[PDB]
Amino acid sequence: AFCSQFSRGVYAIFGFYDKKSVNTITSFCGTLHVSFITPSFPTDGTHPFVIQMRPDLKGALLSLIEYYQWDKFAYLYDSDRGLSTLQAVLDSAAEKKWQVTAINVGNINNDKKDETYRSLFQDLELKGERRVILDCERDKVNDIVDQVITIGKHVKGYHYIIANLGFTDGDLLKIQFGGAEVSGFQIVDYDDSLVSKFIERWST
Amino acid sequence: NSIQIGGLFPRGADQEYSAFRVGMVQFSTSEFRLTPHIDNLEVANSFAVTNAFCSQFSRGVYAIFGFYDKKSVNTITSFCGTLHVSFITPSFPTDGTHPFVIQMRPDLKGALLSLIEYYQWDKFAYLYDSDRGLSTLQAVLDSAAEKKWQVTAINVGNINNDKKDETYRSLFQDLELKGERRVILDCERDKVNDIVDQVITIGKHVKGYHYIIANLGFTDGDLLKIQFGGAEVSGFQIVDYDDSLVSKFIERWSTLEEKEYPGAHTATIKYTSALTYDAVQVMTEAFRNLRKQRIEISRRGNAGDCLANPAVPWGQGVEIERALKQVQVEGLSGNIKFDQNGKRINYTINIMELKTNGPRKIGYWSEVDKMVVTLTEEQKTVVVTTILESPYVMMKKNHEMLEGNERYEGYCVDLAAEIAKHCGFKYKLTIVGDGKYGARDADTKIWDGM
Amino acid sequence: INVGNINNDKKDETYRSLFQDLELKGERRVILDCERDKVNDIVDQVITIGK
Amino acid sequence: EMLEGNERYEGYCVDLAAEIAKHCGFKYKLTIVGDGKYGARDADTKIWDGM
Amino acid sequence: GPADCCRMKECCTDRVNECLQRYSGREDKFVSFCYQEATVTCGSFNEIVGCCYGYQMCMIRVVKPNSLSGAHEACKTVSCGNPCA
Amino acid sequence: GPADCCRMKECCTDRVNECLQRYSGREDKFVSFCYQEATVTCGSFNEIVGCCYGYQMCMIRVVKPNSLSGAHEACKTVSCGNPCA
Ligand SMILES: *[C@@H]1O[C@H](CO)[C@@H](O)[C@H](O)[C@H]1NC(C)=O
Secondary structure, three states, rough: HHHHHHHOOOOOOOOOOOOHHHHHHHHHHHOOOOOOOOOOOOOOOOOOOOOEOOOOHHHHHHHHHHHOOOOOOEEEEEOOOOHOOOOOHHHHHHOOEEEEEEOOOOEEEEOOOOOHHHHHHHHHHHOOOEEEEOOOOOHHHHHHHHHHHHHHOOOOOOEEEEOOOOOOOOOHHHHHHHOOOOEEEEEEOHHHHHHHHHHHOOOO | OOEEEEEEEEEEOOHHHHHHHHHHHHHOOOOOEEEEEEEEOOOOOOHHHHHHHHHHOOOOOOOEEEEOOOHHHHHHHHHHHHHHHHHEOOOOOOOOOOOEEEEEEOOHHHHHHHHHHHHHOOOOEEEEEEOOOOHHHHHHHHHHOOOOEEEEEEEEEOOOOOOOOOHHHHHEEEEOOOOOOOEEEEEEHHHHHHHHHHHHHHHHOOOEEEEEEEEEEEEOOOOOOOOOOOOOOEEEEEEOOOOOHHHHHHHHHHHOOOOOOOOOOOOOOOHHHHHHHHHHHHHHHHHHHHHHHOOOOOOOOOOOOOOOOOOOOOHHHHHHHHHHHHOOEEEEEEEEEOOOOOOEOOOOEEEEEOOOOOOEEEEEEEEEEEEOOOOOEEEEEEEEEEEOOOOOEEOOOOOOHHOHHOOEHHHHHHHHHHHHHHOOOOOEEEOOOOOOEEOOOOOOOEEOOO | OHHHHHHOOOHHHHHHHHHHHHHOOOOOOOOOOOOOOHHHHHHHHHHHHHH | HHHHHHHOOOOOHHHHHHHHHHOOOOOOOOOOOOOOOEEEEEEOOOOOEOO | OOOOOOHHHHHHHHHHHHHOOOOOOOOHHHHHHHHHHHHHHHHOOOOOOOHHHHHHHHHHHHHHOOHHHHHHHEEOOOOOOOOOO | OOOOOOOHHHHHHHHHHHHHHHOOOOOOOHHHHHHHHHHHHHHOOOOOOOOOOHHHHHHHHHHHOHHHHHHHHHHOOOOOOOOOO
16 A cells, blocks of 8 residues: 555655554655654654654553552553553563553453453452553453443442543443542543534534 | 575574575485575565565565564565465564464473473563564463562663663662562573673672573573573573484584585584574475475466555465475474464473583473473581670680680680580681670661671 | 332433432342333443442 | 360460460360380380380 | 551561562571561561461461462461460 | 451451441440440450450441441441550
8 A cells, every 4th residue: 555655656644553564664654755644653763754643651651650659550451552551661660669460451352252351350359459550442441341340340449540542532431430440541632722613513 | 396485584694594505405306406596685674575575476486485573574474474475484483373474483482481380480580672572571471460470571672782881780780679589581692692791790690590591592602601600590492412313414514614604614503594404494395295296386477566456366375385384394493393373383492501511401391291301410617706795705814815716715615615516617706796696776677786 | 219200311310319328228138129121220220330 | 084185184285285286376186195105215126215 | 646457467468478579489487587577567566476476377387488479378368366465 | 266357357347337237226326235246246355445446436436327337338447456455
């Protein structure tokens, strides 16, 4: 597709990439001197000819963990946006006194996953851990949330931190009345006048 | 019967290409002869890999032998997957189900984890870089969560070599803080060597530390550095030099001239190069089995442009793939067999430990049996601390004219003489510095006194 | 407590207030005598408030 | 004669035993030695007799 | 401030465990030491008894070198006994 | 048979609460009674102190008629104080 765009002689390219294809995009845009702008996750390193629209979530997350003063917690991640954030919080856990349990939910197939989550949170019951961080795309986030409500861990005493800029993009009405604390990140403030006008135009 | 096979050698890889040529010579037969087209490139560059691959494709090669990096590996898997061209590589195994790729390198995960269980490590440090992928990391983290391990995951790959001096000193400072001794190095051999030098520099190679090198090249690198350091070092070896095959191969390898074959004059050989040799064997046996099964894979016409849309794959490719995957041969890496996806099966990873006299194999690791162990294997002056109390320990009137234990007299002095006499040691009477018996300071929580 | 007179259109917080008032007395043991639909509704609300 | 087990015995070593077992957290059954000797090493057979 | 029972126990077990971790592989030797430190940091109603006596005893008799994690995980639920005498 | 601490506390609060549930509207009056019975059932290291003293005081000062559930839910996490004195 990229070479198709290139032969057509386009001056710039706007797109998305995945953990697999991102090196192809970086390499090709870097070699052919074509500018690439993407909403997708930031590349870790110095990549020329790429303008990354997505802000870095690392600092916000680590600072939030420090804010809630979490000594020990569970970290739920997938292999889709990369382990960069995971590596980050692991290194920061090494610097601090943090005890972190890293669990990969990405390699679990959606068709056969029922008891996979029950066993997951069973292992989470082993350590008695009530603090949990979800680093995942909105879909996996929603699934995990539903599984949480099903086993009744969304009641009081549990604290969930959703890591993404999409905290209000997923459905929160589910665990909203559960009585458990939920925290997250929002990159778009709907209270801003610009965003308000945009939403007025958007809903119509 | 000229069989065109493309190949990709990263610039600076010599012994690999040397062993490749040696494989070409040894496994050559009158029936058919492989006609390699070698193309040198920058392995980390995706663009370069793409260009080389499409170049080999347009040339109409029946198979490609090469290398990839964490950056370029997806380009190779995706393209080989689309065009149905078989790719054979010594480079790190892909985590997932990748078709049309034959990975010569065995999976180290099981051997490593079983090794951890063998040494009974409850807590340790894990030093990794992102080169071969984080697959192993995910593995040891999930196994750490399952078996209740406390593991410190530290990325040494993101530290720049220009500014890295105090970074590692601070690293092992933070690591010494918790009293954690046990350390695992999963890194490229260069980074490993660097870390080692930093360790000897900071004197962390002393007794009490245990290092586990994760790779198949444990004896390929220089172990003489920390050999006398007094710290235990363990690792993995994919090439057994005690085997007759490897021994004769090594004799012929050592008799080879360095001028014609670069870096080929040696006692040993890098596991990558050996894997390359064995790869040549696998390809030869594959096409041989293709000819024995009476199946003609010969190309009718040129492949055309690899990029041309929609891409159309050739039928023969699948047949060549099946041909390669069904191969079972004997080689430097031991018994060589593949599953449906192309990963290695039934490999034997020799588990080795570095001792004073040198390295030795303490056992082997199998895909089924896990870890199995092979053949099982003056007087210092005693410092006596004491305090002055009557009549337990007292100074003699003439004590200035005497020296050592003759300075002191008392009940405890005589008792000391008796204890030393019965236990048969030389003893040195010394008075404690702070002049206290023993106590715990409520502030510093430090024990003071004898 | 009569759950039958509650209209389905406006019923959201009605059940929350119901089970809040039920939390006042600390009542755990609860008997549902209801039509299958009403049973389902009450159950779903119970899962929502995590009781 | 009317009691059974550790209730049959009373004494300093019995109470001390109860204390030790209570401190170390095990169930203990008091028994009297067979040969009725404390301990000794026979100089010939080199066999220890007694507790 | 105010002193507790449960808090003292959970703290006791955790501090003992975290302490024995620095001594890994010699662990069976230092149990009483780490128990001493833990009694100091978590406090005790009787200085002799310590924060949790039963956990200390269980650990001391069970713990073998490098077996720490399993030993603690088995022993941390044990009854502490009477924190008086 | 050690009585631990935590087991005794959770038992204490549970028995007190369960007992006070039987008296509706009189809840604030019978707190001491139910604490007595609860100390009896759960045992105590010092018979005078009871299973959990701080919880008893907390309930007595907080609990008002018909306010039982909330009062208990607030008071069950409180520090018990010194069990030996
Ligand atoms: C070869 O690999 C398969 C796959 O796990 C295994 O079942 C079999 O036992 C292996 N054979 C030997 C001899 O290890």
